[PDB]
Design a protein around this ligand. Structure first.
Ligand SMILES: *[C@H]1O[C@H](CO)[C@@H](O[C@@H]2O[C@H](CO)[C@@H](O)[C@H](O)[C@H]2NC(C)=O)[C@H](O)[C@H]1NC(C)=O
Lengths: 315, 329
């Protein structure tokens, strides 16, 4: 419930109340006067497990609506002319555990004339290895068409072992990349990087380090062009792929390529932080956002292809 | 017989006896015996002067014994008593002439399970059954060991007289449970041992039957600790966690549907999952267990088991664990 609500006096605010409501579960009449809790804050909610129990519930309130549409037609997904020939991963899907260090200084009080001792915290975070997409593919059209390269990584079996369905699994898939490129009039072979993903963001510069740097261009004339960081909406590059098992799991990779001219049929525009119209017009999760009752179909549009990949975890 | 022994005789006799068991025998000697014999005319074959025979007749007479083609559990205090009367005749035979006679005479008018059950225990414990190997339960009475589907497939084979082997399944919705560690419980081998183990050392044995089984007591302690470990390991290998101990005050969290059927009897009932234990009429009260479990648990805790007189019999010593098993199973 944000202010674009049409009736806030009636529909209230499920989500946000649901954050305060899960937080004082520690003290609802407030007999102890404990402070607010991990869920009543954004830099800390993902910590508490009910955080994801609470968004699973918001999550299928949306799917309820999401699913009421009629499924898509053949004629629906087809971007006639284009066809994915093949999909390949140039490298290895390997994820491991790196090490990071951020600084504990603003945390301890130092008053004055007392001097600063550099204290640091070291954490353990996930990582993967750069890899490249080699998407081989022919534009049968007469000539050069704009393209939306959409890439989802959906799962395959259950954890019961079961092996779900692109209906059972269409919803579970996470987006790995979305980009716009022009396609030549004939068999190109587009290759693209772990590193250029559109949903990702690099780790950011240190506090200090941006002090060092700020300072140096003050006594020096002028610049700071580190535009690299004035928005950064995405998730951590480290989190690009999932962790998986050390034995390895085979995920399913979906590259569906839709038609750029109608997509951007009108217009960063990634983090539209300042008013900037989001550029893709397809709805979001396209085209996996709709019930897909007979796979029979996703399967026979030339511009959708799925290939299996396999990720491995280094201990 | 050879108006006796052999073993490829004793043996033959047995195979004839447990052949098509849900139907009157087809081996003619088994039948004139079946007809002609009188377990009561030469009490001499009998080391009891035939008090055992004389007791079964009495019941077969007032026809107060369980009917044929009906089911049977060894947990029924009467069915058991009837099955075990057959064991006491077959038991006091001086030779094959008395065994074949009786398991022929009886086979033909006592129920099948009492019968299957008596013939086996008797063969296992009685003096007279050395040479023999018993056929595997799984093939003599397949309904206790094969599925419900294969059973129906076999019924059709038969209706139509076209043969063949069917491949059996595994229980629930594999990839949905812990019918993932099924291969273990459902094996015809373990099921065989489980039954044998308790035919070798039965809970009902009295030392009047002839000898004393030695440490059934620890032997009970141990055999089950083994299946419980052996089981706990298989659940390790399946990403499953060691098993919950059951309590009477809690829900039976994990229920199953067995999909198995009796031959005469109906399908095995099923159990719904997250159920509350009910007091079962006829058997015993749920609390009846809860107190039993405390009387138990106080003998362990005290250091002594107390008998009927109020004698305290000490158990903090090596025979310990066997007097505990005699009170616990
Ligand atoms: C039951 O599983 C068995 C495995 O023993 C299958 O029997 C096989 O029949 C197939 C026909 O596809 C042969 O290729 C194999 O040689 C068979 N083996 C015996 C290794 O017969 C059987 O297919 C299963 N089903 C019936 C759906 O019997």
């Amino acid at each position: 419930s944000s202010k674009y609500s049409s009736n806030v006096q009636y529909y209230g605010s499920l989500h946000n109340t649901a954050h305060v409501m899960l937080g004082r579960q520690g003290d609802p009449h407030g007999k102890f006067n404990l402070p607010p809790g991990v869920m009543e804050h954004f830099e800390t909610a993902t910590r508490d497990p009910s955080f994801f129990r609470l968004h699973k519930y918001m999550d299928n309130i949306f799917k309820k609506h999401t699913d009421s549409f009629p499924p898509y037609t053949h004629d629906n997904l087809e971007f006639s002319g284009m066809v994915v020939n093949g999909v390949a991963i140039d490298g290895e899907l390997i994820t491991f555990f790196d090490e990071f260090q951020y600084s504990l200084i603003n945390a301890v009080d130092s008053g004055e004339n007392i001097e600063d001792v550099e204290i640091n915290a070291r954490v353990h975070r996930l990582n993967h290895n750069e890899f490249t997409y080699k998407i081989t593919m022919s534009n049968n059209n007469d000539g050069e068409r704009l393209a939306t390269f959409r890439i989802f990584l959906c799962p395959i079996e259950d954890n019961n072992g079961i092996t779900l369905t692109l209906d059972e699994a269409r919803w579970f898939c996470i987006e790995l990349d979305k980009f716009f490129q022009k396609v030549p009039s004939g068999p190109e072979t587009i290759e693209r990087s772990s590193k250029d993903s559109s949903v990702t963001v690099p780790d950011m510069p240190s506090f200090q380090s941006l002090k060092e740097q700020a300072d140096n261009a003050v006594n020096g004339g002028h610049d700071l062009d580190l535009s690299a960081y004035e928005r950064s909406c995405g998730i951590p590059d480290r989190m690009l792929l999932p962790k998986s098992k050390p034995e390895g799991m085979e995920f399913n990779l979906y590259v569906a390529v839709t038609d750029g001219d109608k997509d951007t049929e009108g217009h960063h525009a990634q983090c539209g932080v300042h008013g900037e119209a989001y550029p893709d017009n397809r709805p979001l999760g396209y085209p996996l956002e709709r019930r897909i009752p007979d796979e029979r179909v996703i399967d026979g549009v030339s511009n959708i292809k799925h290939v299996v990949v396999k990720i491995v975890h280094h201990l | 017989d050879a108006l006796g022994t052999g073993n490829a005789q004793k043996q033959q006799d047995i195979n004839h006896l447990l052949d098509k068991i849900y139907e009157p025998t087809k081996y003619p000697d088994l039948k004139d015996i079946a007809e002609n014999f009188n377990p009561l005319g030469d009490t001499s074959i009998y080391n009891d002067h035939g008090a055992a025979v004389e007791t079964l007749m009495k019941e077969l007479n007032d026809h107060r014994l369980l009917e044929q083609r009906h089911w049977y559990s060894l947990f029924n205090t009467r069915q058991r008593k009837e099955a075990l009367m057959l064991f006491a005749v077959l038991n006091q035979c001086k030779e094959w002439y008395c065994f074949r006679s009786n398991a022929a005479y009886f086979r033909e008018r006592m129920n099948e399970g009492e019968f299957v059950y008596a013939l086996y225990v008797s063969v296992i414990h009685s003096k007279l059954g050395d040479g023999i190997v018993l056929p595997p339960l799984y093939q003599i009475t397949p309904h206790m060991f094969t599925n419900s589907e294969v059973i129906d497939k076999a019924y059709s084979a038969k209706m139509t007289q076209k043969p063949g082997t069917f491949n059996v399944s595994f229980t629930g919705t594999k990839k949905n449970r812990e019918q993932r560690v099924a291969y273990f419980g459902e094996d015809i081998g373990m099921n065989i041992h489980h039954v044998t183990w308790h035919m070798d050392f039965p809970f009902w044995w009295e030392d009047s039957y002839g000898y004393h089984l030695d440490r059934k007591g620890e032997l009970f302690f141990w055999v089950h600790h083994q299946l419980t470990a052996r089981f706990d390991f298989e659940r390790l290998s399946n990403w499953l966690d060691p098993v919950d101990e059951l309590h009477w005050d809690r829900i039976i969290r994990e229920g199953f549907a067995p999909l198995t059927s009796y031959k005469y009897g109906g399908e095995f009932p099923v159990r719904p999952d997250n159920i509350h234990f009910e007091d079962v009429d006829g058997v015993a009260h749920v609390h009846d267990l809860e107190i039993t479990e405390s009387r138990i648990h106080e003998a362990i805790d005290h250091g002594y088991i107390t008998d009927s007189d109020g004698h305290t019999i000490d158990i903090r010593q090596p025979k310990g664990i066997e007097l505990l098993g005699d009170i616990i199973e």
